[PDB]
């Protein structure tokens, strides 16, 4: 019923059938009970459907090392669409489906269980979007300019780990921090790759990182335009504005790369002012 309600079988009246399927999912889904709890058949059905949508992904490695993707991109798209249509179905019926809205111990764990599944769904969609973003770039190029531990972590990274384990999230945060670096070398567009990472895979990307990426953009593009005289004083001055904003949140690894570049461009006095500013914003109370 859940599947039909989400449009499955419709690749073959159809609104009424899907509305009937919705009615069957609500009316006959059961309820949670004390036996440790026994969750409703409605919950197990949602878990069963979701699992079967990602069964080809879960235990599979993300990549195959000339690195490529284990799962074809076209398959990742359809899986994501199916997960999203399931999410859309739960949102449009948050008020009528038991357990979605907040509610005694039985209905409590029913709400917690259903909530956890929905958080996994959005994490699945974010994870898939991240993999698609990754292979839109030149991963082999990114994979080359990488440390061994992170190459090994990426070698045996599964979709399960990407979706549900901190190391996948931490590694994802490293890869995004690396792809933008490379994107700046190609230099097609920084602010487009920004809004790409900002929204779709939000909750995994950080807005303090994109402003940093915007700063490293002008820095590298100030090294690109380095031969020009009057164009840099606008690039380096605007890079400095971007750095000082995220001063209370710059990593020592980035702050160094910034100062290293400033010295190449004889921007001595400016680089000193950034480090002084980063200091005060890490310890405002002095």
């Amino acid at each position: 019923a859940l599947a039909v309600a989400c449009g499955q079988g419709s690749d073959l009246m159809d609104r009424n059938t899907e509305n009937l399927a919705r009615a069957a999912f609500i009316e006959y889904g059961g309820q949670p009970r004390l036996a440790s709890v026994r969750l409703s058949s409605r919950h197990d059905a949602l878990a069963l459907y979701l699992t079967r949508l990602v069964r080809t992904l879960w235990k599979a490695k993300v990549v195959q090392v000339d690195i490529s993707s284990t799962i074809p991109t076209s398959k990742l798209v359809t899986i994501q669409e199916n997960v999203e249509r399931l999410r859309n179905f739960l949102e449009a019926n948050k008020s009528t489906i038991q357990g979605l809205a907040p509610p005694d111990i039985a209905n409590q764990k029913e709400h917690q269980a259903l909530h956890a599944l929905q958080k996994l769904m959005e994490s699945i969609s974010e994870g898939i979007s991240f993999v698609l973003m990754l292979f839109d770039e030149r991963v082999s190029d990114i994979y080359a300019r990488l440390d061994a531990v992170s190459q090994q972590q990426l070698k045996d990274l599964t979709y399960e780990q990407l979706f549900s384990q901190t190391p996948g999230k931490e590694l994802a945060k490293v890869l995004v921090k690396a792809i933008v670096n490379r994107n700046i070398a190609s230099g097609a567009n920084v602010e487009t790759v920004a809004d790409a990472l900002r929204r779709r895979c939000g909750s995994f990307c950080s807005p303090d990182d994109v402003v940093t990426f915007k700063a490293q953009e002008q820095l590298q593009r100030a090294s690109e335009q380095a031969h020009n005289s009057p164009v840099l004083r606008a690039l380096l001055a605007e890079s400095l504005r971007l750095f000082e904003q995220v001063a209370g949140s710059l990593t020592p690894a980035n702050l160094t790369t910034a100062v290293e570049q400033y010295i190449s461009l004889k921007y001595y006095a400016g680089a000193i002012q950034l480090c002084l500013t980063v200091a005060q914003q890490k310890d405002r109370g002095n």
């Binding site: 230099g187 690109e224 335009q225 031969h227 020009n228």
Partner: peptide, 9 residues
């Protein structure tokens, strides 16, 4: 100068 930082660059 918008794409490259300096005319020389």
């Amino acid at each position: 100068v918008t794409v490259f930082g300096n005319l020389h660059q």
